[PDB]
Amino acid sequence: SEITLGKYLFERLKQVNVNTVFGLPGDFNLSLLDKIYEVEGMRWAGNANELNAAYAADGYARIKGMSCIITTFGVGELSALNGIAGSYAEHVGVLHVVGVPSISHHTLGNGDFTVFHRMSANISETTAMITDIATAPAEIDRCIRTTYVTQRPVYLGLPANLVDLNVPAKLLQTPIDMSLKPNDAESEKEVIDTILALVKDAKNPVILADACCSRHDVKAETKKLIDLTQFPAFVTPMGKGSISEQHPRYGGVYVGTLSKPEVKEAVESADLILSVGALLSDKTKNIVEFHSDHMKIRNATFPGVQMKFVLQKLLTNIADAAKGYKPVAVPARTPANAAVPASTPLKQEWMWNQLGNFLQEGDVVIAETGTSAFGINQTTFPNNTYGISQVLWGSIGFTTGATLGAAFAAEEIDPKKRVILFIGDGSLQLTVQEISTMIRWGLKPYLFVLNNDGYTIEKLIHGPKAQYNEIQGWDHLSLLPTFGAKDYETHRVATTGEWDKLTQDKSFNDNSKIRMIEIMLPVFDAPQNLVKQAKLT
Amino acid sequence: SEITLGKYLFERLKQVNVNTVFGLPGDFNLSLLDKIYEVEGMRWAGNANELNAAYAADGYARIKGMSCIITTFGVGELSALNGIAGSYAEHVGVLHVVGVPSISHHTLGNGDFTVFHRMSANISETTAMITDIATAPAEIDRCIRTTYVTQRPVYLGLPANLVDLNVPAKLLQTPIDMSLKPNDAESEKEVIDTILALVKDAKNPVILADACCSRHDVKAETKKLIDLTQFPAFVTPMGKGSISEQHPRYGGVYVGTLSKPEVKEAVESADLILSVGALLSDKTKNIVEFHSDHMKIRNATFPGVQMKFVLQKLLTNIADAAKGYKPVAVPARTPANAAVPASTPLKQEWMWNQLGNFLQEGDVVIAETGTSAFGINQTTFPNNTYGISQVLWGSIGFTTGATLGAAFAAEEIDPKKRVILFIGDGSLQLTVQEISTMIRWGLKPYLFVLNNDGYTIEKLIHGPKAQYNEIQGWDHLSLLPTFGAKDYETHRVATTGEWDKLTQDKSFNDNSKIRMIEIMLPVFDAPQNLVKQAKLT
Numbered sequence A, B: 001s002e003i004t005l006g007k008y009l010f011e012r013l014k015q016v017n018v019n020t021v022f023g024l025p026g027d028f029n030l031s032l033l034d035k036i037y038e039v040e041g042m043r044w045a046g047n048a049n050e051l052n053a054a055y056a057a058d059g060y061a062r063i064k065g066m067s068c069i070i071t072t073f074g075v076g077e078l079s080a081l082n083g084i085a086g087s088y089a090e091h092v093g094v095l096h097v098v099g100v101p102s103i104s105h106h107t108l109g110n111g112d113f114t115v116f117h118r119m120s121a122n123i124s125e126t127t128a129m130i131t132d133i134a135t136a137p138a139e140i141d142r143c144i145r146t147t148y149v150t151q152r153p154v155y156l157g158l159p160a161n162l163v164d165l166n167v168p169a170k171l172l173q174t175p176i177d178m179s180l181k182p183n184d185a186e187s188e189k190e191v192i193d194t195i196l197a198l199v200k201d202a203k204n205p206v207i208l209a210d211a212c213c214s215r216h217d218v219k220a221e222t223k224k225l226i227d228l229t230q231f232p233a234f235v236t237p238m239g240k241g242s243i244s245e246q247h248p249r250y251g252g253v254y255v256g257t258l259s260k261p262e263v264k265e266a267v268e269s270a271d272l273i274l275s276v277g278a279l280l281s282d283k284t285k286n287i288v289e290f291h292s293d294h295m296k297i298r299n300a301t302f303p304g305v306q307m308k309f310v311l312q313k314l315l316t317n318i319a320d321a322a323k324g325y326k327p328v329a330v331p332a333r334t335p336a337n338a339a340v341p342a343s344t345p346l347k348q349e350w351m352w353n354q355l356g357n358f359l360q361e362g363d364v365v366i367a368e369t370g371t372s373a374f375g376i377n378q379t380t381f382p383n384n385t386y387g388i389s390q391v392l393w394g395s396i397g398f399t400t401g402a403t404l405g406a407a408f409a410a411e412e413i414d415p416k417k418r419v420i421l422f423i424g425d426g427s428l429q430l431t432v433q434e435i436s437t438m439i440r441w442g443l444k445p446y447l448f449v450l451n452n453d454g455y456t457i458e459k460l461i462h463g464p465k466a467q468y469n470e471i472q473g474w475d476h477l478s479l480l481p482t483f484g485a486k487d488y489e490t491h492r493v494a495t496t497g498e499w500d501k502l503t504q505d506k507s508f509n510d511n512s513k514i515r516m517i518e519i520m521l522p523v524f525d526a527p528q529n530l531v532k533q534a535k536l537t
Ligand SMILES: Cc1ncc(C[n+]2csc(CCOP(=O)(O)OP(=O)(O)O)c2C)c(N)n1
Pocket: A368, A369, A370, A371, A372, A394, A395, A396, A397, A423, A424, A425, A426, A427, A428, A450, A452, A454, A455, A456, A457, A458, B024, B025, B026, B027, B050, B072, B075, B076, B079
């Protein structure tokens, strides 16, 4: 019994729970594409562009675990590189499948069929050009396993002839191994023992969860490590959402010198740091760095000890190792907004603080690079909030495509999960078309547009009234109907009373339809942290 | 007097007549952008996105001769690559300046600042990463020179700390030399002698003007060749616009089996083909191919013989060598559309035939990849008409970007000149935001959108009713008002009498404002030949 290699692929993605496929049709992938519709439960999004399709595959991967985008040779694959590069930089598992010319137009005119391939290799964890149907199955399995486990994009070139070539159906009965290989027994024990020893003598331990605590599936574990030790817990901007914020031991968002003094104080105060961190983007010497494929304890490095299994194993013992810890007070949460007359103009500072009152458990919150990304660090999330902020890549326009991906993924996990976006008016312009795809599928994201007339974050760094920091003023509330939305809602908010009246409304709170909210704000208005950050940069 | 390095760039650009710069602001280019406003005659377009800006730079360059696009490290340069690759593939001189960090966010997280430079090197004629002020001026010059002479994209990396360093203003007093190196004397002598020999014995010789007849300077040399020999002249789809279609010796568009039969026969029966600037496609014996960097006679190649020198010397003796020529009749041009009831539904075979009545000398006509680019080949142009058809690279949203760039370039040449776009409903989606930039500058193109509901060129070849060939339906006429347009016109056309009524109107024929014309066509409708090819496939 046999199946086409083109259907093998889609069957493998169904087994890994990639049910939606991103990308655009083109000359070299039509026969692949046809196979999606033969796989019950699969769907082709129909993106408005390849860049947008990649931003989307990122959004989807962030939520569901992995994603797949399919493009066509030359023209499709090159348009998507900015998305791909960003998933590499932030450790998002995206499988980029490119439909290429059959073994032997949309070329550079020099007979070089490997150039686009070479370009991609610089931003892929691994790459594969399928040449033989004999190894082909094993190559797809490999690419899929690797995208999953390293959480990095992988490139797979598939010649048009092969797609319709047959393979043994039987191969689908054995699942792809999607799990981490166990740790070296001995090094793993030494790490565990050393950490336990350190916890025993620390008087003021602190936990700090960054990017990779989320990106590398360790949130249930970090979460329980806090309950078992009662140590103060801080998150960085990229890790925001990694830790439940209504946890009585959550201390806030640590952003170094830019940290609200007590946070700065409580963190720099520690005699022990358990960093379920990330990069060396930049107290004591007593730091434990937890990393996806290695540990570091003070100056000691332990290559290939995976944090997943050390964390799991520490949970069985840590409590008795910390039986002796006297709980230090955690910095108080920022107080609620003092009541004001309904006619008070909306200001960012008041907004970000007030937003914690509309959010709910299970929401997915996306903030674009600009004032939005700075502001969101000032909002307190209900527990179980998934935040998306591209702090490291910082490619504006990313959130519209990502919102599409997260809504698709969220629709699949639970139809009640709300997807909320905060996007600058300047950023929207780069990827606005993707809204069209939201409409087509009946997804219902909350799209909040920050109308402040131009590039505020840029104006705050350089050239406040410079022509290049200014944009063409669009009629945003007409966007929905222009893209053929039938059932949607549009709102404009400019004061605190409009903010409250709208966000406390019962009906508004249910994701029953797609909605756009235009936020009227002053030009030089920004959250305290951007006011204080960028000022210096 | 001494000036900034950043200002020096823009004064050189203006010396080679680039008055509009494309791109988007970012973290590493703000200080360079400041320099554009210190230079009289220069303008920052303010693009809605980087891919769209690359496409515009391409269209600007096609018109003016060269262009410049400025982006920012990582996020910005990566987004433009599909545009840059197209300019490389089709020989369009685009200079891509990228603002880079300071020689000390938006990286892959690995400390490697060269990865992006390296990626672009594969789609660039040459590349430079400036690092020394003492050498900078010469490097800027070299890159400008190379872009202009090779008619291929160049990558120029400019650290933000250098653009503010001073250089002697006296440098701009000695212009960049665009002179070409002479050819190997014996190879060139050999080519010239052989071509004149072939011409002498030819009974039915024809001229073929292809793609790089225009971007490569030879349009003048080519016309003199026609006048001097009286040989019938044909263009290929990529060279349309290169020969004036009202010339008595012009015989048509040579497509393959797709050409008009009278045209297919006329070209195919020639005993000598003089092919100028071929990137090509294509009984046909004696084929002389003129290329910018090489000649080809029959099967023999002469690497290094530049067509430029060969054409100029041939124009001195060609009339002698062809003096025995007895003028063959050129194929007769397509007869006017027969009269039909005003009620008749719009069909493409009819429309492309009818469009020639609307065009005027000096027009700029752009056609997107899809049915429009197949159809345009059936249109008869008045003299001095520029055609833009991205035949080889074939990147579907290219034309909305191209249009903005040809509109700015035309404006600088002569504001009375019209820019006319033919785009499918499906391609507009990938690049629709760039209509916004056209509005901001008060540019006034004719934007004709072919609404045939989805991807008909692909439906004609594979999956006539495959979901991946359909698209979300948009309210096309609401795009202008959604983007803040103030002075504009919108129009819908569905029948023959509607076409005529609009296009014969005198106010309509005047480019007093931006216009959008939506054309309703049947889903499987296309140029006939295209439809017939289609079924035997
Ligand atoms: C693709 C890309 N191009 C350019 C930039 C540079 N950039 C960073 S912030 C910004 C302006 C964003 O404006 P807006 O979305 O209006 O946010 P605001 O600060 O006004 O809320 C720009 C152009 C980038 N990060 N990525």
